[PDB]
């Protein structure tokens, strides 16, 4: 009765909506059916413009009208693609105000809401039924049921004598769809005073599955509903749309999510003669000086290139950076910026961490009594960067639990039957203090550093930041900080965080330069000289150097060269990059070792 009229109304929107000379939804449908994507994304501002009455119904009773807009889409799709196809999914976009995760309460039950959060977990896909074929136990009578996944359905209780519940499902004739579960945590800043962050369970269907990964900020449009698991119901959100700032699909598979128009911008930016300067200036615009550390951070974000030799050996392609220095140097602020610019990043404190917190931990499911594996900081940061602050407060065991994941980029587990070798391809950016809090020049370098040579050799570049009291520099820093406190270039000398992050993603998924012979000869000669320099320094002092120079440093120089080449989308690394890489190595690691 009314259902047919509602279906007719939503069908006329898809067939009559033109903003100029193009039918936006009719053409979107045809283009989607051609690539086998049975869905239509509709913007709710367009529906409020066609007929406000249709929006009033879709917002007053969402779980009753949404199922009738899907069938209208399916009918129009059949009319457009078939010359005389499952039920089509409807994905919604809205610009309504976002309700804070913790402000959702009884006043929003069964209503369309928009909210943001952080995805902390994702489930293994399940299978939900969409068309059952049933039969009767006694008289063997065949029937079918059709189900929409919008709850306010079960097998018939009485046959069509036959006892109660006479119907058994015939599986080889039924059809199913995909279902996923997500946990959404509220943003750290939104949380009220003295409160732990709160979770919320979410479910997505069909083409909204496998769209997010744990640890990524997302925006959700859905229905705040309830399901019975006494007179209380556990709330949850039925997703109707997902929007994210991270192209997770490009990151897991190939290069994707870059439009040709967007791609053209990246090539134009790469063609800039002084992209290195722009990127260096774009990191921490509010921190004065420390240019070398900012260049090192650019190289770390860019990364090197990984090689798999024919015999099977793999060569690490990531760069690890350590910041040792005195208080007030802005190491923690640099780490907090790097966590915010990188596409994937985790900020962790060495004190509030553990060996299982990093890597992976073995957990027991209370229901199935079965042990399973949950990823830690280094798994949650896979393919990105881990910012381990307070690296000196970490316990010896928890620090030792990081060697293999830092070098081999794998997390071997052998616990509770579970036996595996996970993958953790992450870059470590660590900040630490010397033993006495300040780097005391009076005592030998072996007295100011408690890190063992094994852990230190795993860092590509080591920065020993010393705070020297110079009146000119002090006045400059005072002026800069006061300007910050009392007080937008965007004129080719700096790019916002979003653009820089997208450019990092593009470069990582598009380029992997290789060394030319001249660079190889140059780097090889430099390694021989540096090793001789360590030996002359060692012969002079009975004490064995605390900062080592092993083959890992040669590989680190190669990685820095490759990252500098990749920064400009150059398929080959030339001497103009080798010189910069050698300069950075001398400015950080040989500088630390010389003292």
């Amino acid at each position: 009765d009314d259902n047919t009229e509602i279906i007719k109304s939503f069908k006329n929107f898809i067939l009559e909506f033109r903003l100029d000379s193009q039918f936006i939804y009719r053409d979107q449908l045809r283009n989607n059916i051609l690539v086998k994507n049975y869905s239509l994304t509709v913007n709710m501002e367009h529906l409020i413009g066609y007929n406000e009455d249709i929006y009033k119904k879709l917002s007053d009773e969402p779980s009753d009208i949404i199922p009738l807009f899907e069938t209208a889409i399916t009918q129009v799709a059949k009319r457009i693609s078939i010359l005389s196809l499952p039920t089509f999914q409807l994905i919604l976009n809205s610009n309504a105000n976002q309700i804070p995760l913790r402000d959702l309460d009884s006043e929003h039950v069964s209503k369309i809401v928009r909210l943001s959060g952080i995805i902390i977990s994702t489930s293994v896909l399940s299978s939900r039924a969409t068309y059952l074929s049933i039969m009767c136990r006694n008289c063997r009578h065949t029937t079918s049921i059709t189900i929409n996944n919008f709850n306010s359905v079960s097998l018939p209780r009485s046959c069509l004598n036959c006892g109660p519940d006479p119907y058994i499902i015939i599986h080889e004739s039924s059809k199913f769809i995909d279902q996923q579960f997500l946990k959404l945590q509220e943003i750290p800043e939104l949380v009220p005073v003295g409160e732990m962050p709160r979770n919320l369970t979410m479910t997505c269907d069909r083409y909204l599955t496998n769209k997010v990964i744990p640890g990524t900020r997302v925006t959700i449009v859905g229905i705040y509903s309830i399901y019975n698991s006494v007179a209380i119901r556990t709330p949850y959100i039925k997703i109707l749309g997902i929007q994210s700032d991270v192209e997770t699909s490009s990151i897991w598979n190939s290069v994707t999510m870059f439009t040709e128009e967007e791609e053209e911008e990246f090539l134009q930016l790469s063609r800039n003669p002084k992209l290195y300067e722009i990127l260096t200036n774009s990191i921490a615009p509010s921190i004065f000086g420390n240019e070398d550390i900012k260049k090192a951070i650019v190289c770390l974000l860019m990364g090197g290139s990984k090689k798999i030799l024919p015999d099977g050996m793999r060569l690490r392609g990531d760069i690890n950076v350590l910041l040792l220095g005195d208080p007030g140097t802005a190491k923690s602020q640099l780490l907090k910026f790097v966590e915010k610019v990188s596409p994937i990043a985790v900020y962790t404190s060495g004190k509030g961490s553990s060996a299982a917190g990093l890597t992976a931990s073995v957990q027991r499911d209370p229901m199935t009594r079965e042990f399973y594996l949950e990823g830690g900081a280094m798994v949650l940061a896979d393919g990105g960067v881990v910012c381990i602050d307070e690296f000196d407060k970490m316990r010896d065991e928890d620090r030792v639990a990081i060697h293999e994941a830092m070098e081999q980029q794998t997390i071997s587990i052998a616990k509770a039957g579970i036996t595996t070798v996970l993958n953790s391809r992450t870059s470590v950016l660590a900040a630490a203090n010397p033993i006495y809090g300040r780097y005391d020049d009076l005592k030998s370098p072996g007295d100011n550093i408690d890190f063992q040579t094994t852990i230190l050799s795993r860092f590509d570049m080591i920065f020993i930041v010393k705070d020297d009291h110079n009146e000119e520099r002090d006045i400059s820093i005072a002026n800069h900080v006061i300007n910050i406190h009392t007080g937008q270039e965007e004129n080719g000398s700096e790019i916002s965080i979003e653009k820089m992050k997208r450019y990092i993603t593009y470069c990582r998924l598009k380029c992997a330069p290789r060394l030319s012979p001249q660079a190889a000869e140059k780097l090889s000669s430099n390694f021989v000289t540096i090793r001789k320099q360590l030996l002359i320094n060692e012969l002079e002092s009975t004490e064995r150097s605390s900062i080592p120079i092993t083959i890992r440093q040669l590989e680190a120089i190669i990685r820095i060269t490759e990252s500098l080449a990749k920064l400009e989308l150059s398929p080959i690394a030339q001497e103009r990059h080798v010189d910069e890489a050698i300069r950075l190595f001398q400015a950080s690691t040989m500088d630390a070792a010389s003292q």
Partner: protein, 189 residues
């Protein structure tokens, strides 16, 4: 070289519009040029323009008609195939004959786009209805083209009553695929 790479072997949409704009159309002059200066053309006939009388049907080139309409000195008379009823009939013909294309003119899409853009007050039917009908016809013909593309071969192929803009759209894919098929077949012998 002398010719860009995107204009090689095919025409651009602007070239198709240029070709279409040389066909005659019917206009109602709002001025009386007939005498009871003078046009002097070399690419078309000029007798019709020299003999115009207010509110008297006459035929001129499409681009001259558009130029006159820009001055509010003539009202273009829309073709007979571009009425609502005729488009309904063509849609029905397409629906009942899954294996053939309707007998629309070879310039229906281009002329429809030009006249909708330029002469919006010279139609006797609401413009939105005509736009919808043309969209429907385009979708049906697109379905038919998609179905018919499954018969490409190393021999000839026939696409009767297919219009100029559609053929221009499909020329690269069809020609290159059939050329590769012919190359394989010829290599076979």
């Amino acid at each position: 070289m002398s010719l860009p790479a995107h204009l090689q072997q095919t025409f651009s949409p602007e070239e198709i519009q240029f070709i279409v704009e040389n066909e005659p159309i019917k206009i109602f002059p709002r001025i009386t040029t007939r005498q009871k200066t003078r046009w002097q053309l070399i690419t078309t006939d000029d007798k019709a323009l020299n003999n115009m009388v207010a509110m008297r049907s006459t035929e001129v080139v499409l681009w001259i008609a558009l130029l006159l309409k820009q001055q509010s000195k003539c009202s273009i008379v829309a073709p007979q195939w571009l009425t609502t009823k005729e488009l309904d009939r063509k849609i029905q013909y397409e629906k009942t004959h899954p294996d053939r294309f309707s007998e629309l003119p070879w310039n229906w899409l281009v002329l429809a786009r030009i006249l909708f853009n330029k002469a919006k007050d010279d139609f006797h039917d609401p413009i939105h209805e005509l736009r919808g009908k043309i969209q429907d016809l385009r979708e049906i013909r697109q379905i038919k083209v998609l179905k018919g593309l499954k018969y490409l071969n190393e021999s000839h192929l026939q696409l009767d009553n297919l219009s100029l803009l559609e053929i221009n759209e499909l020329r690269p894919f069809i020609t290159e695929i059939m050329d590769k098929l012919r190359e394989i077949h010829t290599a076979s012998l």
